[PDB]
Amino acid sequence: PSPYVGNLLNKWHDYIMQEKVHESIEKRTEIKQLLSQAEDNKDLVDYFILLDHRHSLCFDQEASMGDVVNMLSKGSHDLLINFYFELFAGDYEFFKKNYVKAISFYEKAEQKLSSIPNIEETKFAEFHYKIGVAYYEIDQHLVSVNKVTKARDIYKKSDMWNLEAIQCSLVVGINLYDMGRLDDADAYFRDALTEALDHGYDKPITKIYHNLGLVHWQKGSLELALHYFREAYSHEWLRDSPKGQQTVYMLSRVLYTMGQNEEAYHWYELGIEMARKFDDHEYKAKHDILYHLYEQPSIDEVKQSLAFLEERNLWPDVSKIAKGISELYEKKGDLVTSHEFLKRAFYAKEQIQRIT
Amino acid sequence: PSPYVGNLLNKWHDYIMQEKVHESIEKRTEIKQLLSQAEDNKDLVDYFILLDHRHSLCFDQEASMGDVVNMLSKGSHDLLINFYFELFAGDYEFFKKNYVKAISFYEKAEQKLSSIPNIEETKFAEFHYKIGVAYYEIDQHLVSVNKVTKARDIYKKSDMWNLEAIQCSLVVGINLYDMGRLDDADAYFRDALTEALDHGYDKPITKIYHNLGLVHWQKGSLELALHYFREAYSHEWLRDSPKGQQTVYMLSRVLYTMGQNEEAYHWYELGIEMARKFDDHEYKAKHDILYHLYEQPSIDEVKQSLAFLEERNLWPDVSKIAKGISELYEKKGDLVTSHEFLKRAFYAKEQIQRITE
Amino acid sequence: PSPYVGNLLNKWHDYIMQEKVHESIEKRTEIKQLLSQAEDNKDLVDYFILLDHRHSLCFDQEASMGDVVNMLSKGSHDLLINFYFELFAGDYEFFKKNYVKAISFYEKAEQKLSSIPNIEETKFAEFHYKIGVAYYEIDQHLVSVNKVTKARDIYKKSDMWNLEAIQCSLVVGINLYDMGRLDDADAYFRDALTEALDHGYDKPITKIYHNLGLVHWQKGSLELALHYFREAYSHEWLRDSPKGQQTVYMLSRVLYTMGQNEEAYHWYELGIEMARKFDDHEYKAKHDILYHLYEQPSIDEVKQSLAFLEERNLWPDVSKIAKGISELYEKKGDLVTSHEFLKRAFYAKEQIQRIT
Amino acid sequence: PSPYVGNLLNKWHDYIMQEKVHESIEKRTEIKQLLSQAEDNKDLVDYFILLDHRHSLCFDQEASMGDVVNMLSKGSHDLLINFYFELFAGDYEFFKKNYVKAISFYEKAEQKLSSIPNIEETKFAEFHYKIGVAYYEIDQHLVSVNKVTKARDIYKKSDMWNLEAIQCSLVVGINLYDMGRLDDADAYFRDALTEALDHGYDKPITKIYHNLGLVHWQKGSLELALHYFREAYSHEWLRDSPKGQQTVYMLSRVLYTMGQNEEAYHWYELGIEMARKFDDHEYKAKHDILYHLYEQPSIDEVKQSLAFLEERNLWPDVSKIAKGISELYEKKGDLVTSHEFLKRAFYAKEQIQRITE
């Protein structure tokens, strides 16, 4: 249910406000088509109606059907419309990677939740989660754990929202890992895994196994980390989704670190070939560094690809890759360029606090 | 036909509740037709929309192939619909003269008014006024003054809604007059008059002058009472309102109570003729009593017309009319039949406390 | 629990507001004494405390115990104090016979009932009744029935307030009688009577029987009316209460109307003797008219006593007594003075609408 | 000793809940004694009264022989007491450095703030500020800026509470500096300075100048950084505050980073001597690293003092100090030990994300 239609409905709201018949008929016709699918978002349809009705009051031929200066129901329509405008603007800003603006809009919409009459317990969890995830994108991990736990506690009660609870504990686990509290993250991931198995869910499982792989990778038990990355690739057909690119990369990277090189190059091959398929320039850079480090060394070529990743922000990945390089160039006895990369790995850490 | 459509919209709400497509499309079409008359009511149009949408969701389902399983907006639409249903049921009961039922419905709708957003101060004054006038209809004057003052105080603050404030002080004054507190009624009436003159208004003026005329009539200064009734007739072209009958009648009755029988008959003539134009049997009865008292006396004929007014539950005017007769027939030396009418004027007073709906 | 202490507490509130230590210590000492009884009014004690505490904040030696400019709790203390001030002012104005002012204060206090946190269902019935009874004093019978029915419906629910429900239906019945709907008033009175008998209550019974007597008196069945007035005198020792004066009067008046005269004079005697006992000048006037009508006629003497009652307002009683006289002076053939009294009975009716 | 009394009052509330006369009279006397210090806290006194009354009703019963069976005022007193209990529990947890628990309690008390009458806009800003600073304590800078801006916007409206607004912009700036957004921190700091100068205020000025000094220090323009640290020392008599230690340290460190070793040692001297006056082992460690770096080098001695700072969970300053060392030891040609410290400065960075309570 793409968050474009939300922005479309928001634009339409702006067009009714500027009293512009012709582009208002345009926006409502694009929108009217898109939501004709079988079952796509209660909140969209409601916002459509609430805009269509106020569209009429400004554009349809009232001259025989009264004078709607400002009726009693405007107060309550205003409240819903302002709320829907802010919920969907939040969703769209989150879509554009503009997380600070997204939180701003969500928090305004969260406020209006009290004045709406029959608000359900779950519309509060929705905002708890959306805010909590947006905070996770900007490395505010403690508040993220705080808000999505609040959502999880609601989703635990009712037994219809069991897929959401799994996603919530998945998000707490990721926060706990990004911090470094690895055994707590492990626990959350394992609790999501068994809850996902008891039910028929398959969607989250893949992410769960990949995170478990990351936990034990950072834990240093690479044998067990490798196991989980394999299981992530096994479960769900990811080879032609864009989102399964990361598992192929991790598989290659661990096998190169354990000195497995033979298999590691085969996952490199598959990952280069996927970087073709989706034209993902970043995963091409990341697999480039693997190749020009373990296959055909070239310190200058690694800097080239590293430079590209630094131009893309992506500073967690830069920090950890550059640290890896410096650690490696130390067992190879070269202090001079190991220091060069540690300086780059350190600068990357400082780039994570800024979050511009 | 304002609160008829309200009852129509209420019935339509009742048909959606019973999940009945066929009579819902019927009433929604008469109303859709009926609401095309240019006639200022925001709340009717609003209630139509709020019902049209709930009509669609139960019978049409939008023609877009949505889901519409109790959306976020259902909660608040429910609340508005429940409110409109009771406001218009109140208006309709007020229409059928069932004032106790009307207050009951208004007070229920007044409650739900608190739990609604962006409400103007005046939507509360409206219920203060409606309840206050319904109480006036059942001779509960002290509470009516209390409630319509509450409305007046809000309408005074805005200073944009002062045409309503004038009507409020008009209603307080009328209550005070029906009680007998004549100088207090005078004060309210004169204060509404100067407020109506300071701003650009002619609509209320005529009623204002007619009440001032009534006050000083009951005060006994008939010269000044006659003055005000003249001004009421002058200030609007009343020869074609149905409601301007009351000024013509008082003019005749005042001039007959004074010794100006010649002019008094001229207004009698006009008032009989107005009783023709409209199907007003009351003012024919009241003008009948005038004629069979001052022109060609006939105690039996007066009894007939008075009897008709008593059959109409018009117990205030009967009380006052019968008292007048008794007072007159005493300076005419006839105690016997003066006592007959004082007994009837007294019985009428007891009929004013006793009122049933 | 006299409504003087309420006015006392209100005066004290006024003295703290004018920052007047010395008369504040005076008022709180009179009050502190009076409420030392075993069990006298929750609301009084609460208002005392709430004033004593704000008394301290203006008068006690804070100089070492902080600077109470305006703390957080002032908002909520203000609300309770303003409420108690208006409840007890209402009670006191009702005490002074100033019913319009009393309703004004009650209705302001009724409004504040929503903002207080744990308000019980019965504090609303209390105001419904108090307002409803105040309206009854000023002949606004339809609204009185409306409000005290609202109170009665609350008192019906819980089974601890069964004495109040009896009083409520007693008040509806009186309204219905003052209007003239005699069979409905009869029904309410009979329903209060059986409810009072099922329980051990004796306080209302006497008033119930006297009202039932009035109903059937106005109904014209004087035999049965006389029965109830007797039963009113029988139940409860009223001969030395001021409030039992009215039953002795009714007993005498009915027996004089039925031509019983022998017994009627004996109740006249007792009623004159009670008018001595309490110096009730009105019941002396009312019994005077009985005597100078049925015992030693004197049209001039009746006018004298009637004049006194008209100087006391009491216009219901004047209207009905004067009407009685005129009716009687008609079977005696004297139209001249019967008309004199009907004029006076009619004027009295007009005095009931004014209520100045 | 402000939030100690809060915990004392909370314990007293706990003793009334367990219906325990003997320890209730004890704590209520220490608090009654302790609150005689002239020290601005409305809310403490208020909480005492609200507890003293509930103490009486459970143990004294007023000494007037009342009834006091849950009166009308009990409902609202309950609500205030529950609120004060959680506000002061929050303050006490903040006192013990347990910031996550403190936010938990503040957020609970923030909820009950909505259901209370006559509330000022600022009592909401207070919780915005307290929560915002607690989040700053656990390096959650983006939410801290978000919450303390919310406080600032209320404190700006009043225009009576602008000394608080200055403190709010001080806190936003510090967050922005801890992040690295130096020009945005600069802007907030300069805007607080002009607001502090336009009105009559000296209290914040010193901290304002010290942060501006820090910004441009991290910006690398040491000449102007040195200027601001001088002004911080000048603007208040800091020779007797414990908190003015930080300006003396920066002055020395800046002058040592520049080539002004002579003056730098004079501020080192003063800073060692201040580390004596107070039991501040941190600033002795930090000044120790300065001395064993620029005066009498000893890489092993620096490791000792740095180690002490790492044992204190002071991971920001260790990150910056270790980075400084590594940078310096490279122009000194020694890559080997420069790498040793960059590894430690990097480890310190990872220690800043990981924080446990």
Numbering used by the authors:
A (entry chain B), C (entry chain B): 9 to 364
B (entry chain A), D (entry chain A): 9 to 365
Source paper text:
The apo structure shows that RappLS20 is all α-helical, consisting of 17 antiparallel helices that are connected by short loops. The inner surface of the solenoid is lined by the even-numbered helices from H4 to H16, which form the pocket to which the peptide binds. The TPR topology is lost at the N-terminal end of helix H4, as helix H3 is located towards the inner lining and helix H2 towards the outer lining of the solenoid, an inversion with respect to helices H4 and H5. The loop between helices H3 and H4, indicated in red in Figure 1B, therefore marks the boundary between the NTD and the C-terminal TPR domain. In the absence of Phr*pLS20, the NTDs are positioned such that they allow the interaction with RcopLS20.
A recently identified B. subtilis RRNPP member, RappLS20, is encoded by the Gram-positive B. subtilis conjugative plasmid pLS20. It lacks the conserved residues essential for phosphatase activity and has been shown to regulate the conjugation process. RappLS20 activates conjugation by acting as an antirepressor of RcopLS20 (22), which induces the formation of a DNA loop by binding to two closely located recognition sequences near the Pc, thereby inhibiting expression of the conjugation genes and plasmid transfer. The presence of the Phr*pLS20 peptide antagonizes the antirepressive action of RappLS20, reverting the system to its default state.
